[PDB]
RNA sequence: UUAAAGUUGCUGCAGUUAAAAAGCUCGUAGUUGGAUCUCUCUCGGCCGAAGCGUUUACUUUGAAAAAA
């Protein structure tokens, strides 16, 4: 049955950068989608996304740009603290200069780099490159 | 005519109370007026030179409010320039529960008291002889929201004008920004 | 995907959209609720008044109309079973199973078929005492089933 | 493929679908209004139903229940709700 | 591909597909760069300018070489809307 | 012909597609080709949409017309309906033919004696010369091909949908691709009809 | 004895044919679970007490953590 909501809605737009597509459906959606999804449209990887309201669960209509390589999701969320982040960022991202750690602290749903300035710790959503 | 929950009446709703009081010597409304009330009123601005006042009513007495409404927004659009008026209850806002909070929520909130399950019935009744039939919530690239909803083909012709107004009143009364449509089909 | 089967089936209702009741129903609330007492003082099910009203009196929703569902129409009036409907129907299925099978013994299908009857109800059973619809010493004895229905 | 408007399907796309795979689900029946001849009555009558429809008047059948769809019976005759 | 001092660090850069932003590799033979050229406003006889679209060998390899193309040729208003 | 009325399709030119048949596609349909058709009537027969297929004469001409040299556009056909109408194109046009036999490795095997090195490919039956397409793409060749409903579109480029069974619908679309590619070039305009009459291009059965 | 050993694998292995998926199914414990909800009262000099709110996990700070 459909553990993890956030981890098959990451790999529906992940199996659609492989195939070529300029959109995704993403059903169903919970608003830890919709946080995760506006950190990747901030830093330019996906572009503008339509929230298709049914009365049950929406669906999200994602249009995608040809920027993303990788999306992907950590699951169990394990508990980051900032003085372990440093390896969290050289176990899952490909360099130094881009790619994002994306973890749901107490100030938000936010990156690795806005979670070092606001000085916060959380748990581990996923990363995209 | 007017209640207002604090008998803190205004020179605005006034003219709105003198105006349904007609209503009770002129129309076939005579048995309807006489049970109901009104419980604010604000007249306000949209469109750049449009002016437009909505009209607040008690919710149990809303959808008695709903059979006279058509014949209500012609007699009171008749009597003044053009200046839209809409019908939306009287809806309190409970705020989420933090984790400090005092000693009267011994009883939790309803979540009809909800600024999720608010903020969609004013929608509901704001636009009222026309239903909504869908919605589709757009983000921007700045993160910005813009609600698109959509609304009956059948009636059209009589609220389709008042759509300019429709956005400024939701502007004002709840913060975010609508567009509305009239599709084709289902 | 189906509990006790293997089959992967899609097959239900599709509720529409518009939530409201639509113009031409000319039965207020206190009306329908009238209709369900009439209906269950007949002796039928929860989910046998919703269908009776659908087909004949046009009443798409009850929940709808008149803004609570069916089961708390009755709970709230009085006209309630004590063992809800579905419990009931596996009950009094698991019954026409067990006696079938004295009669024939050998049926080694329904003696598998019974045990999926069996570990449904259970799987309710510990729903209904955490929910609190059921007090919390009920339990399926094998042979107090005839009295229960 | 590869560019599709997953935003606005056309409404032959619409109708082809489950309706449960659409992309809002709409339901496909219906509310009819069944006029039997014999009578003068009007009784609203739900498109796929069950169990038989009965006349309140002439207490005669309106509609027989069959797999999917409810058939009506010969000389009744009925107007689509909206 | 660029330092600090703002000079460029790079062989070359290489030039991505106009169809899905992919970027077209060094050794990738099976790529296309197709110029399509524009013609006179009034009298329809070649201008000398041309539209340069570039399809990268995974999509030509899909088939999905002329239905890219083609709405690119529809993006720069070049074929006939519908 | 981009919302322009110089490049329209006139009257005359819808007679003689449909005199032809350029408009009757197959009895099967590629899922990739599902753009350009009309309908399925009764008998199986799809008929191709005819605005779908002026507009993409029209973008393939100027795919031709965009190549400076005449002689860098190859032209190829291996069935015998299209080997007097390549012969007949490449000699007003000025492209290079390859009618008949494609011995492979024309295109890689710079050692042979048949080695060319075009601009532009432009075939005339993606399942019947294959050859040339998958040739194509070892040596970054963009690819029209005059394409049937049933007839894939790998390798291809801009694939006009016509009807390139009967012979008579060959030598027609041979004959509009060699009338826009001249008239969108410097040659004579599109005031009078052209003199050169397309059943110049048809295939003569003995 | 440690690395080499991603040949013990949490990171991070394998299980058609190389070693390997229980004959099949039910099932208690374990493990994992779909959408959804935007700080105030009695006192002292407006600023401190006292209470919280349903309880926690998480995170950040603090103080306490023998020397070598």
């Given amino acids: ?129 | 005519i007017v209640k207002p929950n604090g008998e803190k009446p205004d020179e605005f709703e006034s003219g709105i109370s003198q105006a349904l009081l007609e209503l009770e010597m002129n129309s076939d409304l005579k048995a309807q007026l006489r049970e109901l009330n009104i419980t604010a009123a604000k007249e306000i601005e949209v469109g750049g030179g449009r002016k437009a006042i909505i009209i607040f009513v008690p919710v149990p007495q809303l959808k008695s409010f709903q059979k006279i409404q058509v014949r209500l927004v012609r007699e009171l659009e008749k009597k003044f320039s053009g200046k839209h008026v809409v019908f939306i209850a009287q809806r309190r806002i409970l705020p989420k529960p933090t984790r400090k909070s005092r000693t009267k929520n011994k009883q939790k909130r309803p979540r009809s008291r909800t600024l999720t399950a608010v903020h969609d019935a004013i929608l509901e009744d704001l636009v009222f002889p026309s239903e909504i039939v869908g919605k589709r919530i757009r983000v921007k690239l700045d993160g910005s929201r813009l609600i698109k909803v959509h609304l009956d083909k059948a009636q059209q012709n009589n609220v389709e004008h008042k759509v300019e107004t429709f956005s400024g009143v939701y502007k004002k009364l709840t913060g975010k920004d609508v567009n509305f449509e009239f599709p084709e089909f289902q | 995907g189906r509990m006790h089967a293997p089959g992967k089936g899609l097959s239900q209702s599709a509720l529409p959209y518009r939530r409201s009741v639509p113009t031409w129903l000319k039965l207020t609330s206190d009306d329908v609720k009238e209709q369900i007492y009439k209906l269950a003082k007949k002796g039928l099910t929860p989910s046998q008044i919703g269908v009776i009203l659908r087909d004949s009196h046009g009443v798409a929703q009850v929940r709808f109309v008149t803004g609570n569902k069916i089961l708390r129409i009755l709970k709230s009036k009085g006209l309630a079973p004590d063992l809800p409907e579905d419990l009931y129907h596996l009950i009094k299925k698991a019954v026409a199973v067990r006696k079938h099978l004295e009669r024939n013994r050998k049926d080694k299908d329904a003696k598998f078929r019974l045990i999926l009857i069996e570990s449904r109800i259970h799987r309710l059973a510990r729903y209904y005492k955490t929910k609190r619809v059921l007090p919390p010493n009920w339990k399926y004895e094998s042979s107090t089933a005839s009295a229960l229905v | 493929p590869l560019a599709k408007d997953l935003l606005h399907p056309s409404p032959e796309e619409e109708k082809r679908k489950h309706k449960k795979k659409r992309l809002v689900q709409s339901p496909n029946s219906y509310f009819m209004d069944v006029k039997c001849p014999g009578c003068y009555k009007i009784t609203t009558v739900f498109s796929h139903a069950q169990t038989v429809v009965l006349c309140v008047g002439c207490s005669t059948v309106l509609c027989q229940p069959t797999g999917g769809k409810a058939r009506l019976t010969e000389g009744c005759s009925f107007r689509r709700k909206q | 591909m660029q330092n600090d001092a703002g000079e460029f660090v790079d062989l070359y850069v290489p030039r991505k597909c106009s169809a899905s932003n992919r970027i077209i590799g060094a050794k990738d033979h099976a790529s296309i760069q197709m110029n399509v050229a524009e013609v006179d406003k009034v009298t329809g006889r070649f201008n000398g300018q041309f539209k340069t679209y570039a399809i990268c060998g995974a999509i030509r390899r899909m088939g999905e070489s002329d239905d890219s193309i083609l709405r690119l040729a529809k993006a720069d208003g070049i074929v006939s809307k519908n | 012909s981009g919302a322009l009325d110089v490049l329209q399709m006139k009257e005359e030119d819808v007679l003689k597609f449909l005199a032809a048949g350029t408009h009757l596609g197959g009895t099967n349909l590629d899922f990739q080709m599902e753009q350009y058709i009309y309908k399925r009537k009764s008998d199986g027969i799809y008929i191709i949409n005819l605005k779908r297929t002026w507009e993409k004469l029209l973008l393939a001409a100027r795919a031709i017309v965009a190549i400076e040299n005449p002689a860098d556009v190859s032209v190829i056909s291996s069935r015998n309906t299209g080997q007097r109408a390549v012969l007949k194109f490449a000699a007003a046009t000025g492209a290079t033919p390859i009618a008949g036999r494609f011995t492979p490795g024309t295109f890689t095997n710079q050692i042979q004696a048949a080695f060319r090195e075009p601009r532009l490919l432009v075939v005339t039956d993606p399942r019947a010369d294959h050859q040339p397409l998958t040739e194509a793409s070892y040596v970054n060749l963009p690819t029209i091909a005059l394409c049937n409903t049933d007839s894939p579109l790998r390798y291809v480029d801009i694939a006009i949908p016509c009807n390139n069974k009967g012979a008579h619908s060959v030598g027609l679309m041979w004959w509009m691709l060699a009338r826009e590619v001249l008239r969108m070039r410097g040659t004579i305009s599109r005031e009078h009809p052209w003199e050169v009459m397309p059943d110049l291009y048809f295939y003569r059965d003995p």
């Fill in chain 1, 1 to 129: 049955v459909r553990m993890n909501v956030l981890a098959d809605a990451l790999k529906s737009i992940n199996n659609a950068e492989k195939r070529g597509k300029r959109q995704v459906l993403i059903r169903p959606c919970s608003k830890v989608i919709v946080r995760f999804l506006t950190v990747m449209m901030k830093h330019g990887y996906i572009g503008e996304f339509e929230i298709i309201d049914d009365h049950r669960a929406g669906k999200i209509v994602v249009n995608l740009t040809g920027r993303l390589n990788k999306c992907g999701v950590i699951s169990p969320r394990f508990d980051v603290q900032l003085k372990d982040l440093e390896k969290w960022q050289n176990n899952l991202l490909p360099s130094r200069q881009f790619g994002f750690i994306v973890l749901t602290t107490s100030a938000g749903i936010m990156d690795h780099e806005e979670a070092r300035r606001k000085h916060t710790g959380g748990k581990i959503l996923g990363f995209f490159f």
